[PDB]
Amino acid sequence: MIQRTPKIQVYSRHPAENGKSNFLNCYVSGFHPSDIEVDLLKNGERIEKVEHSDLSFSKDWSFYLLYYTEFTPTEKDEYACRVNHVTLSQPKIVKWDRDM
Amino acid sequence: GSHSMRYFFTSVSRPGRGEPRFIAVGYVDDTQFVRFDSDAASQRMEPRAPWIEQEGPEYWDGETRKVKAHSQTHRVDLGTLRGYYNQSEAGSHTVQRMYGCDVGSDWRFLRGYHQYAYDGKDYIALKEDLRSWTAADMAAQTTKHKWEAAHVAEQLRAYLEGTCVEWLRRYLENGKETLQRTDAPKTHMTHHAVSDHEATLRCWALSFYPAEITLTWQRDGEDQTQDTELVETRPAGDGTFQKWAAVVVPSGQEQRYTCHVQHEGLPKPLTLRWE
Amino acid sequence: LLFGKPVYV
Ligand code: NA
C-alpha cells in the first residue's frame, strides 16, 4: 500500500527574540498513512504541553499537521522536532535553527 | 477575487481497537472554520474561525447531525472497500473524501468537486461536467455503476451549484474581515557563509495571507530555478503563512542576485537585493 | 454547509 514520507520543518511563529514569548512549530506534511508520532524537544527532552492542528490533506491526498507549543527562546536552549512514521526506520530529529 | 469552500474527511479503520477514527474539517480559501473529530469528547461539529461562532444552534445542531451521518457512511465504506479489494480484517485502511465549490471573481459558480481516495490513491471522482465519474480501479467500477443507477451526480450537482456556493457567499460576507482580507508578506534576507568562496542568500516572506505566493531568485535578471532551494509554504499557526527561497552566491557576486516576490497583498511585485 | 444526503461506495 501507498506510503509517503513526511517532510518536516521546525520553526517559530514570529522571528525569535530572546526573552520574548513565541510559538515553536513542527510542520509535518506530504505523508501517508496518517498515523504519525511528533514530539517537540527542549534540550533533548519531550515537551509535555504540545497541541496540534486537525488532520487535513492536500490535493494529492497526502496529509499535513502542525504541532505547536508556547515558548520563550533564550540564548542557550536548544529545540528540536522528533518524528516517527512507518516510512522512517528510526525517529528523525530536526533541530531548530533560528534561521530556517 | 475568486474563492473556494472545501470539506475534507478522513476515516481510518483500527481493527481490534474499536470504531474507525473519523476527522472532518471545512475550509473557506486557506482558513479552517469547522472541525469534527470522532475521538473528541464533545461529539459536535466545532467552530475554528471567529466568524462562524455566531451562526447559532440550528446551524451547529444540523451540521453535527450531518457530519455524524458522514462518519457512519465512511464506517460502512471501510467494510465495503475491504470486500471489494479482498483484504483481511486485520489491517488498518484509510478512506478520504473531499467536496466543495469554487466561485470566480464575480462570485458566480465556477467549478465543483466530489472525490474519494482509498489507501492514498484516487478511487472515484466527479468529473468537471458534474454528470459523470472517473474510476481507475476495477473495484471502483462497482461504485461508479452504483452511483450512476442511483443518480448521485444529479444530487451532488444541485448541491455544488446551489447550496455550496450560496453558503460560501454567506461565509464570505459574514467573515469579510477574515476572508476578504489580504496580508502582504513581510520580507527580509539572511546571509550565511558556507565556506570562504561562497555564501547562502535566503529570501523570506512572512505573515502573509492567502497562502499562494511566488518567490524566485534571478542572477543578472535570469531565473535561477535549477539552483534555488525552495521550501514548501508553511503555516505560522496564527492564520498566516511563511516561505523562503535560497541561492548559493559565490564571493563578490551578491549584487548580481535579485529576489522577486509576487503576492496578492502587494501593491506591486517586490524586487529585493542584498546591499 | 455540509451536503445532506448519504452516499455509500
Ligand atoms: Na518507523
What CATH number has the domain bearing residue B254? Answer: 2.60.40.10
Spell A68-78 as b/e; 16+ CB within 10 A means b: bbebebeeeee
Calpha distance B36→A55 (Å, rounded): 10
- Substitution target in B163, B165, B166, B170 with the highest count of C β-carbons within 10 Å is B163
Residue B275 lies in a domain: no
Terminal CA-CA length for chain C: 22
Question: How long, in residues, is chain C?
Answer: 9
Same domain, residue pair B198 and B258:
yes
Who surrounds ion ligand 1 at CB < 5 A?
A 84, 88
Contact: B206, A15; criterion CB under 8 Å: yes
The rounded Å distance from CA A89 to ligand 1 centre is 5
Together in a domain, B133 and B117: yes
Contact B136, B122 (CB under 8 A): yes
| B94 at A interface, C-beta within 8 A | yes
Residue B214 is placed in which grid cell? 511566488
Q: Are both B32 and B131 inside the same structural domain?
A: yes
**Coil, helix or strand at residue B255:** helix
Structural domain of B116: 1-181
Contact A3, A89 (CB under 8 A): no
User: Is there a contact between A32 and A86 (Cβ–Cβ < 8 Å)?
Assistant: no
DSSP SS3 for B155: helix
At which residue does the C-alpha cell 483500527 appear? Answer: B14
Beta bridge partners of B134: B125
Distance from CA of residue B55 to its chain's centroid?
A: 23
Whether residues B77 and B211 fall in one domain: no
Quick check: helix, strand or coil at residue A79? strand
Question: Cell for A62?
Answer: 497526502
The residues that bridge with B247 in the sheet, in sequence order, are: B201
What cell numbers appear for B144 in the block? 461508479
What cell was used for B241? Answer: 503563512
- Which residue bears the cell 508520532? A37
C-alpha B104/C-alpha B162 separation (Å) is: 15
How many alpha carbons fall within 13 Å on the CB side of residue A73?
19
Examine the fold and report which residue of B144, B161, B181 is the final residue of a domain before the chain moves on: B181
B153 touches chain C (CB under 8 A): no
Q: Where are the beta strands (DSSP E) in A33-78?
A: 37-42, 45-46, 51-52, 56-57, 63-71
* Boundary of a domain, candidates B166, B181, B196: B181
For residues A73 and A20, the answer to whether their CB atoms sit within 8 Å is yes
Q: Name the residue type at position B94.
A: T
Q: Residues near B191 by Cβ (< 8 Å), separated by ≥ 6?
A: B199, B200, B201, B202, B254, B274
The resolution of the experimental structure, rounded to one decimal in Å, is 1.7
Question: How many Cα atoms within 13 Å fall on the side-chain side of residue A20?
Answer: 7
B155, C5: Cβ pair inside 8 Å?
yes
User: What gap in Å lies between CA B206 and CA B189, rounded to an integer?
Assistant: 11
Q: What are φ and ψ of residue B264, in 5° steps?
A: -60, -25
Span between the terminal Cα atoms of chain B, in Å: 36
3-class secondary structure, B164? helix
Phi, psi of C3 (to 5 degrees): -60, 145
Whether residue B173 is found in the same domain as residue B217: no
Identify whether residues B199 and B257 lie together within a single domain.
yes
With beta carbons under 8 A apart, name residues in chain B contacting C4: 66, 159
- Per-residue cell: B98: 473531499
C9 interaction partners in chain B (CB closer than 8 Å) = 77, 80-81, 95, 116, 123-124, 143, 146
The closest alpha carbon to C2, from B52, B130, B142, belongs to B52
Pair (B126, B210) in one structural domain: no
Q: Is the CB of residue B27 less than 8 Å from the CB of residue B9?
A: no
| DSSP state string for B167-198 | HHHHHHHHTHHHHS--BPPEEEEEEEESSSSE
How far, rounded to the nearest angstrom, does the alpha carbon of residue A98 sit from its chain's CA centroid?
Answer: 14
User: What is the CATH classification number for the domain harbouring B78?
Assistant: 3.30.500.10
d(CA A41, CA B70): 37
